[PDB]
Design a protein around this ligand. Structure first.
Ligand code: SRM
Ligand code: SF4
Ligand SMILES: [K+]
Length: 465
């Protein structure tokens, strides 16, 4: 009653879309397509009668789901809508090559990989084991900076677990990408703590052996020496909602989809709308790491026809910058591990946050705000400026002090509190931010600067109070 597709970089054809739309509507309990924050999609509630039909459906359009249980990798991410549009094709080709290279070495724990195009960190590289940060010259990839060892999962009350950001190893020319990817994976395979499953992730391996030790073994196995890191900076993690110009005469329409949940709602036929777009659209779709959808490669002559369907179906309903930059995991009703609501909580929670932002005169601003239903961390709250981590029904740990670009873990601020208490705290804090912030200063950076919360500087040692 849960299927998830392999879909490197989130790129899905309109023929593939029509097939998964038909299956979702006819052969699942919930009737939805759920976009995931690893750039793929899920069905919910597949009856026993429809388990063979769904793998045959995927195969009929060239898709595979083939998970996982004995076979550990997850979907390889790729920046969906780079500002330098010409870089996407090559970066996506490399995400596909890496994905195919790592198809079945049993790993100690699942392993997550990304291809990132600065200045966008939409794929949230610090949540991932292995990250290839693209470096380009003259519109062509020349190589990657490698960052290793991110991961967000924690267990409540267990100070031996922690979220960790990823560590820079150095730069590699493009030709060494697959050798380096294999070397990182096999080093983790060999050095990971297999016995203790809560200690098996690469983030723990790196802390046990040291970054230089792991890096040296990767160099030896890959047959390379890393070069110094080549400069890169991120400016944000959000999607580019609306129309942006791509390559040639093409345009990309990114649609905000709340929680990535695609279903026909009253007066908002989101699912039928996307089907009608799939039937006329000349290009592909791209599922983003923010659970949104890009209608990619629209010729200028077709913009008006695509926008008409999107507007009439509810897919272009205006929301605040705050809502565009908020995210939650699935949680209830389908997740067996859920402690508190996330997806079903987020719309009314952000309604309340929207009122606080307006009350303090910052309705045009945003705070990267995420809700995760339990500390496994799928909603990526442990990279948010404001993160909520489910503890029990209606109760969350409130974390503060991440940043807009996702390079710092937020420390826990208040433990095991309800929504009214969270909103009361955030009302006070957003008020202070609005009045005391420096020009362009984000909410998370402010809570650190103003001494509201201490920063997390070295998570393996200082995440836990
Ligand atoms: C759908 C998604 C959340 C979303 O709203 O988008 C999701 C949903 C679930 N995740 Fe995940 N995870 C999703 C991204 C993540 C991420 C974020 C990311 O990868 O960018 C994390 C934190 C990053 C990390 O791994 O450190 C994440 C860490 C987990 C973990 C904890 C892993 C660990 O190291 O301890 C579990 C539990 C487990 O593996 O035992 C888990 C388990 C689950 C399961 C399958 C629960 C289960 O084991 O039975 C969830 C199914 C819920 C449902 O009913 O659909 N999921 N999960 C994401 C699907 C991504 C995908 O296509 O593969
Ligand atoms: S964070 Fe917990 S509740 Fe949310 S989807 Fe992941 S496992 Fe389920
Ligand atoms: K979304």
């Amino acid at each position: 009653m849960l299927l998830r597709c392999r879909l490197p970089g989130g790129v899905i054809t309109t023929k593939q879309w029509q097939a998964i739309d038909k299956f979702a509507g006819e052969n699942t309990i919930y009737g939805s397509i759920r976009l995931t924050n690893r750039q793929t999609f899920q069905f919910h509630g597949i009856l026993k009668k429809n388990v063979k039909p769904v793998h045959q459906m995927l195969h009929s359009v060239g898709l595979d789901a083939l998970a996982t249980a004995n076979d550990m990798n997850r979907n390889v991410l790729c920046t969906s809508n780079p500002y330098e549009s010409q870089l996407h094709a090559e970066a996506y080709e490399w995400a596909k090559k890496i994905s195919e290279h790592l198809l079945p070495t049993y790993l100690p724990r699942k392993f997550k990989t990304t291809v990132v195009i600065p200045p966008q960190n939409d794929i949230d590289l610090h949540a991932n084991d292995m990250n290839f940060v693209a470096i380009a010259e003259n519109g062509k990839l020349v190589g990657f900076n490698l960052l290793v060892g991110g991961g967000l999962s924690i267990e409540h009350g267990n100070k031996k677990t922690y979220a960790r950001t990823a560590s820079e190893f150095g730069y590699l020319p493009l030709e060494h990408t697959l050798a380096v990817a294999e070397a990182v994976v096999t080093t983790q395979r060999d050095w990971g703590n297999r016995t203790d499953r809560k200690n098996a992730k690469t983030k723990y391996t790196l802390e046990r052996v040291g970054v230089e030790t792991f890096k040296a073994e990767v160099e030896r196995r890959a047959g390379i020496k890393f070069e110094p890191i080549r400069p890169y900076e991120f400016t944000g993690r959000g999607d580019r909602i609306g129309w942006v110009k791509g390559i040639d005469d093409n345009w990309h329409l990114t649609l905000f989809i709340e929680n990535g949940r695609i279903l026909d709602y009253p007066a908002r036929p989101l699912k039928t709308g996307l089907l009608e777009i799939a039937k006329i659209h000349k290009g592909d779709f791209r599922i983003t790491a923010n659970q949104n959808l890009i209608i990619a490669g629209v010729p200028e002559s077709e913009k008006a026809k695509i926008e008409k369907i999107a507007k009439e179906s509810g897919l272009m309903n205006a929301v605040t910058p705050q809502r565009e930059n908020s995210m939650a995991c699935v949680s209830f009703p389908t997740c067996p591990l859920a402690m508190a609501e996330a997806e079903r909580f987020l719309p009314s929670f952000i309604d309340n946050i929207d009122n606080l932002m307006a009350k303090h005169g910052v309705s045009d601003e945003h705070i990267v705000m995420r809700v995760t239903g339990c500390p496994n961390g799928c909603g990526r709250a442990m990279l948010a400026e404001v993160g909520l981590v489910g503890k029990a029904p209606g109760r969350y740990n409130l974390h503060l002090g991440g940043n807009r670009i996702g390079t710092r873990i937020p420390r826990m601020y208040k433990e095991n509190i309800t929504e009214p208490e969270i909103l009361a705290s955030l009302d006070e804090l957003i008020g202070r931010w609005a009045k005391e912030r420096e020009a362009g200063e984000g909410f998370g950076d402010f809570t650190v600067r103003a001494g509201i919360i201490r920063p997390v500087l070295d998570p393996a040692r200082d995440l836990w109070d």
